[PDB]
Amino acid sequence: TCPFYKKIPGTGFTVDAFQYGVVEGCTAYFLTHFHSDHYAGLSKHFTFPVYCSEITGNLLKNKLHVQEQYIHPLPLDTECIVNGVKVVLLDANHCPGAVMILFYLPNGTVILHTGDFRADPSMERSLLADQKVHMLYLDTTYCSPEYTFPSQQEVIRFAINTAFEAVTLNPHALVVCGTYSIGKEKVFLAIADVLGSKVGMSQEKYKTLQCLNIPEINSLITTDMCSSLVHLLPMMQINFKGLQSHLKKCGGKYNQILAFRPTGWTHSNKFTRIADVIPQTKGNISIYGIPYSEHSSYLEMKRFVQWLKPQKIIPTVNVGTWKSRSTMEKYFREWKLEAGY
Ligand code: NI
Numbered sequence: 001t002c003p004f005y006k007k008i009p010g011t012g013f014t015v016d017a018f019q020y021g022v023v024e025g026c027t028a029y030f031l032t033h034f035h036s037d038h039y040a041g042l043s044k045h046f047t048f049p050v051y052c053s054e055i056t057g058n059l060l061k062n063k064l065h066v067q068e069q070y071i072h073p074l075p076l077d078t079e080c081i082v083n084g085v086k087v088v089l090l091d092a093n094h095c096p097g098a099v100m101i102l103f104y105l106p107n108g109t110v111i112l113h114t115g116d117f118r119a120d121p122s123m124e125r126s127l128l129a130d131q132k133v134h135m136l137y138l139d140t141t142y143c144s145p146e147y148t149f150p151s152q153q154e155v156i157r158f159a160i161n162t163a164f165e166a167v168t169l170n171p172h173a174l175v176v177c178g179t180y181s182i183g184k185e186k187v188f189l190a191i192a193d194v195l196g197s198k199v200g201m202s203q204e205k206y207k208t209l210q211c212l213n214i215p216e217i218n219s220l221i222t223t224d225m226c227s228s229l230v231h232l233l234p235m236m237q238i239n240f241k242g243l244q245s246h247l248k249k250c251g252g253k254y255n256q257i258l259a260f261r262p263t264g265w266t267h268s269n270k271f272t273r274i275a276d277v278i279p280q281t282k283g284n285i286s287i288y289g290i291p292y293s294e295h296s297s298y299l300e301m302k303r304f305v306q307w308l309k310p311q312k313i314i315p316t317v318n319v320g321t322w323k324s325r326s327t328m329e330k331y332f333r334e335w336k337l338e339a340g341y
C-alpha cells in the first residue's frame with residue numbers, strides 16, 4: 001500500500017509510486033528520475049500513463065522496455081495540462097533527466113515535489129519565483145547540520161589535478177572510476193578530458209549513457225577498453241581485490257591503478273578538507289573516496305526552504321523512524337522562526 005507522502009491531494013496523481021500494484025484512484029503516475037528506489041516496480045508490462053522528462057523517457061523505453069504508448073515525456077520550464085491539471089517540470093540538479101514537479105490544484109493550492117534534488121540559488125530564478133507554494137514534498141536526505149560537503153566544482157578540481165599529476169609522473173598508470181547508477185558522470189568525463197582519452201566501459205553502461213542527451217557524447221565514451229586509459233567499473237569492484245583482477249586483464253599495458261569512488265557524504269567530512277584527502281593504498285593500487293553529492297547539504301536545503309517559505313513541509317526521506325522525524329520537524333520550526341514566515 002502506497003504511503004501518504006507519495007500521493008498528491010486533489011488529484012488522481014502519484015509520484016515515484018510503481019511498487020504498490022494498481023493504486024486506487026491513480027490516473028497518472030509521475031516518475032521524477034531514473035533511480036531504482038524510485039522506479040521500483042516499472043517493467044515492459046506496465047500499462048498506465050507515465051509522465052516524466054525526455055531523458056527519463058529514453059531510459060524507460062531502452063533499459064526497462066516500457067512500451068512507447070505509455071511514455072509521456074514533457075518539456076522542462078513549460079506549463080502543461082495533464083488530466084485537466086496545470087503542471088511544470090523543473091531541473092532538480094540531481095542526475096540526468098531528474099525533475100521537480102509543480103502542481104497547480106483546481107482549488108488554488110500550489111504544491112512543489114522536489115523529487116531528489118541538490119538545492120541551488122539558481123532555482124530562486126526559475127518559474128518558482130512567480131507565485132506562492134502552499135505545500136513542499138522535500139528531499140530531506142541530508143537534513144542535519146553534521147552533513148557538510150564541498151561544491152561539485154571543488155571536488156572535480158581535486159579529481160582532475162590528482163589524475164593529471166599521477167599519469168604525468170607515470171604514463172603507464174590506469175585510472176578507474178566506480179559507478180552503480182546514472183548520475184555523477186562529470187567525475188569520469190572531466191578526468192578523461194584532462195588526459196585526452198575516451199572513457200571505456202561495458203556495453204550495458206555505454207547503452208545507458210547513450211540515452212542521456214549529453215552533447216558530443218560519441219566523442220567521449222567507448223566500448224573499446226584497449227584504446228582508453230580511463231575505465232569505468234561497477235562500484236562493487238572498487239576494492240584492492242577487484243582492481244588487481246582488472247589490472248591482470250589489461251595485458252601488461254599498465255603497472256599502476258589510481259581509482260575513484262564517488263560516494264555521498266562520509267564522516268571523514270567532519271574533520272578533513274577536500275584539499276587534505278588521501279587515498280587508501282596497497283602496493284601499486286590507490287583508491288580515493290571523493291564526496292561528490294547530488295543531494296542538498298543541510299545549509300543548501302535550509303537556504304532554499306527559507307527562500308520558498310512554504311506553509312507546510314512533508315519530508316520524503318528519513319521518515320521511517322520517530323527520532324528522525326522529530327529531528328527534522330525541529331529544524332523546520334527553527335528555520336521558520338529565524339526567517340519569520
Ligand atoms: Ni536519486
